[PDB]
Homo-oligomer: A and B are copies of this chain.
Amino acid sequence: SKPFVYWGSGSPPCWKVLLVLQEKKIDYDEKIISFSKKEHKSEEILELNPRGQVPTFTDGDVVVNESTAICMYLEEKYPKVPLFPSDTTIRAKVYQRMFETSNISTNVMEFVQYKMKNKDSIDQVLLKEKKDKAHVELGHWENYLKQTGGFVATKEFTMADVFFFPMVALIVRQGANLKDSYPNIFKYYNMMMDRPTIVKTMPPHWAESDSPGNLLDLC
């Protein structure tokens, strides 16, 4: 049995899956679909995933789509390279950080959404509201990296970094100068960006396209 994963460029849910696969060094087959050409809605994809989304994934008769379910399945199916420590108490912290990352999406990426959605309708009395929420959110993670001095959950790479980093990258892709404002996250970013597995899974379309820059003002 050899895993197969349909995924697109610039998608954190897909990145999570690719990182897990690479980090555990599992040989897999893939189909890099085009979002702009709506390939995530192909019939081939819909048979496996009624929601027409990526990642979509198989491994024999095993079919799983939620990026988080795929990662959990991979951790359980291919145990040789653990992305979780063995200590139950410490694993709890890894799980905490993993799932807590859904907050970045809401409190951070909302800042970008707003400027794009209701554009031309810029209300700085509200703009400064969500901007402060983004910073409040990032502060938590900043403190976390500060607290460990290394990776988002512990002093080693774990499933939590698989969830967190893609979000950090997307933030920087939007142009966040975190160098001085969030020295720990930035230190974490540059550190991670240097990890082989991450260099290998950078979103394909990023190199030859310009940053959306919806965050150039962040900090």
A73 at the interface (CB under 8 A from B): yes
- Find out whether the CB atom of B92 lies under 8 angstroms from the CB atom of A64: yes
CA A92 to CA B102, docked complex, whole Å: 21
Interface residues of A in 96-110 (CB under 8 A from B): 96, 98-100, 102-103
Q: Is A66 an interface residue (CB 8 A)?
A: yes
Q: In the complex, what's the smallest C-beta–C-beta distance from A82 to chain B, in angstroms? A: 14
In the assembly, what is the distance between CA of A78 and CA of B159, in Å? Answer: 22
Q: How far is the CB of A97 from chain B (nearest CB, A)?
A: 8
Total count of chain A residues near the partner, CB < 8 A: 27
* Residues in B neighbouring A64, C-beta threshold 8 A: 92-93, 95-96
Quick one: copies of this chain in the complex? 2
> Interface SS of chain A: helix, strand, loop or mixed?
helix
Specify which of B61, B65, B88 is in contact with A89 (CB 8 Å cutoff): B61
The reply on A187 being an interface residue by CB < 8 A is no
Q: Does A76 contact B (CB under 8 A)?
A: yes
Are A69 and B98 touching (Cβ within 8 A)? yes
Residues of A within 8 A of B (CB): 50-51, 61-62, 64-66, 68-69, 72-73, 76-77, 88-89, 91-93, 95-96, 98-100, 102-103, 140, 143
Contacts of A89 in B (CB 8 A): 61-62
Which 6 pairs of residues, A with B, have the shortest CB-CB distance?
Answer: A69-B95, A66-B99, A73-B92, A69-B96, A68-B99, A72-B95
Instruction: Evaluate contact between B61 and A73: CB separation under 8 angstroms.
Output: no
The distance in angstroms between the C-alpha atoms of A50 and B147, with both chains bound, is 14
Question: Separation in Å of the A130 CB from the closest CB of chain B?
Answer: 15
Q: Which residue of B lies closest to A72 (CB)?
A: B95
